Write a protein that binds this ligand. Structure first.
Ligand SMILES: Nc1ncnc2c1ncn2[C@@H]1O[C@H](COP(=O)(O)OC(=O)[C@@H](N)Cc2c[nH]c[nH+]2)[C@@H](O)[C@H]1O
Ligand SMILES: Nc1ncnc2c1ncn2[C@@H]1O[C@H](COP(=O)(O)OC(=O)[C@@H](N)Cc2c[nH]c[nH+]2)[C@@H](O)[C@H]1O
Lengths: 357, 366
């Protein structure tokens, strides 16, 4: 058996269920603010990360996954996604004299020693807005994170740190920023030693910390579009570690369940019943949009098939043996109470609607 | 300025909206069959691919992105996802004497020459079912793909090719009665469902782990979805023998095919309401009314103008985003507790009390 590269995790069926609920919530809250999705390559050229994050940084100094391509070109698996974003923005023409409100989700890679919060393949959701300069947009992004925390019920577990690393212009801009948050009741701490670990930020720097600590981090980087070869454009954004979010919800929120995988299990036994079973299932799929129905396969006597229905968390089992098939019926069994009734096939969909919701 | 690696694409805002509409439909139809999502690493050890896919195959021979790790270990960006799936299944204990019906979505990487169907970073959605043997689950998976095509409206544009390549023994003699029975049973299930298929005897797949059922859904770079059975692979990579069947589909080729054959499969506009706001110290009021209307209209796309701009600029910005309605806020509205509601489609603008704006928008949108 081959095993997994250390620090690269698999997310098994039970836990992805939770992952899909939290992502759906996050994308919804981004949708209500009018932010569009951009999808960017996993691999970029190594000079981008060297030129944008900075040469004397732990990321470039010791963390990147770099390798030589079949044409000599060095390629690096992205360690963060902002550089890639700016790059595509410049390349495609999306940023000059334009405003963009964007978000992205995907894997990032860093060769760090794995410990509980830190991984080699980890996933980030991040936002980047281009074209807005003043403190107002920076306050809209902090308002956006605050909403996500309310929505995931973790609000009384995340602290906001802020400060400027720029200066008159930056004293004014940071102050106006601080004024917008007071006037919204967002509680923040000005922490003068909060400099971030990447060298492209300038005025606003912030971090939402829990008590590996930082759950979300971001800031402003007004110069980076020009540095990577484009026209000067103001830009701000952040990225959050979806691994640490998932962990914090699950810990602070215990009663965060997700939807079970099967609702109705199609039990079927007897000679040549399986085409009938699969045909009934396809019809019930047409009739009950968005019902998780699973067709028993590989035989098994009724006792086995009913226990399999219990394994998946089915609430109702539709049964069919030869009799049902010849008589045009289907037996509907409410697995919660045992009450089973024979219904005509034409009427089973309505009988399930009643039993499920 | 740096550019993108040749054969690796960026999907910009306009096209990603189409991409989410097609993926929601696919995931919905998989959920109706009770299929669970699994998430797997993008980099695996190189021997996995060599062992599973086969040494003398074009993927191992000339396509993989391999590189050396800081400890000597050879690592390879995955070129396909089935190997990683079985590896995780065996490593975690999911497959022995169990039934799993899984799916996965993500990037695969192959060093090959850029074409219209072929890229170097591509994305697949694939399904893996473990524990079921007979032809009936193979027929469930071909039924699942047919439903997707009806749902995406591309049904009259994709053809099904099917064939059995038997077992090692029959191949090494070169199906064999057990594979003739299994295949026949499979062809019987599809005819009884009205799924039209072609038995194409030259159809062998390009990976060497497959055994009885082999199939491809082809359009007229051709193959949009491809799969087959692989009853031995779990033991080959270290686990106990378990029957397994699955497929994978090239999401780039699907998105291309829907867009072509279904010209106006249209996506969501990304803003519904634009909040216009000018005048002295209006912006905190503007951002506060925006937050409140978000609580009051769940799932409306509302964007707050920022950076000033005169009303004329701000209304044109509303047009850029496809907003239907603009809610306006000058100094006057702030003091009088109002907000102006302007129906951008007709110009009709009324002043509404801020407590009554949400209801006025509900009426105007849907
Ligand atoms: N290894 C590892 N594991 C888990 N989570 C990890 C992680 N490395 C980072 N993170 C998470 O990501 C956020 C932010 O990471 P930083 O390296 O602190 O900063 C950035 O990536 C910037 N790109 C942010 C940005 C985007 N636009 C502007 N600025 C960590 O806090 C952690 O949760
Ligand atoms: N380069 C490139 N670009 C885009 N789409 C691409 C592509 N290379 C392949 N594809 C898409 O993937 C399917 C299948 O490709 P194959 O290399 O033929 O094989 C497989 O992936 C198997 N893993 C399938 C499987 C999974 N479980 C069981 N069997 C192509 O048809 C094309 O659409």
């Amino acid at each position: 058996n081959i095993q997994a590269i250390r620090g690269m995790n698999d997310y098994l069926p039970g836990e992805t269920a939770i992952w899909q609920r939290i992502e759906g919530t996050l994308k919804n809250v981004l949708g209500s603010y009018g932010y569009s999705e951009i999808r960017l390559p996993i691999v970029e050229q190594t000079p981008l990360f060297k030129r944008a994050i900075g040469e004397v940084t732990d990321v470039v100094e010791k963390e990147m996954y770099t390798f030589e391509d079949r044409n000599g070109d060095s390629l690096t698996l992205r360690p963060e996604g902002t550089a890639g974003c700016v790059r595509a923005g410049i390349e495609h023409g999306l940023l000059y004299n334009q405003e963009q409100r964007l978000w992205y989700i995907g894997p990032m890679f860093r060769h760090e020693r794995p410990q509980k919060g830190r991984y080699r393949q980890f996933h980030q959701l991040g936002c980047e807005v281009f074209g807005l300069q003043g403190p107002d947009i920076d306050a809209e992004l902090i308002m956006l994170t605050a909403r996500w925390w309310r929505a995931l019920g973790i609000s009384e577990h995340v602290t906001l740190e802020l400060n400027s690393i720029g200066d008159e212009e930056s004293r004014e801009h940071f102050a106006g920023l601080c004024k917008l948050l007071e006037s919204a009741g967002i509680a923040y701490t000005v922490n003068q030693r909060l400099v971030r670990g990447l060298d492209y930020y300038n005025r606003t720097v912030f971090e939402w910390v829990t008590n590996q600590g930082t759950v979300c981090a971001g800031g402003r980087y007004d110069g980076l579009v020009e540095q990577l070869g484009g026209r000067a454009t103001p830009a701000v954004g952040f990225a959050m570690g979806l691994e640490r979010l998932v962990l914090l919800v699950q810990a602070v929120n215990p009663e965060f369940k997700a939807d079970p995988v099967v609702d109705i299990y199609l039990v079927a036994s007897g000679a040549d019943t399986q085409s009938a079973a699969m045909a009934l299932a396809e019809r019930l799929r047409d009739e009950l949009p968005g019902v998780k129905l699973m067709t028993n396969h590989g035989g098994g006597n009724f006792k086995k098939q009913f226990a399999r229905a219990d394994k998946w968390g089915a609430r109702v089992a539709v049964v069919l043996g030869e009799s049902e098939v010849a008589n045009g019926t289907a037996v509907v069994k409410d697995l919660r109470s045992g009450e089973q009734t024979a219904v005509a096939q034409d009427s089973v969909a309505a009988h399930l609607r009643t039993l499920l919701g």
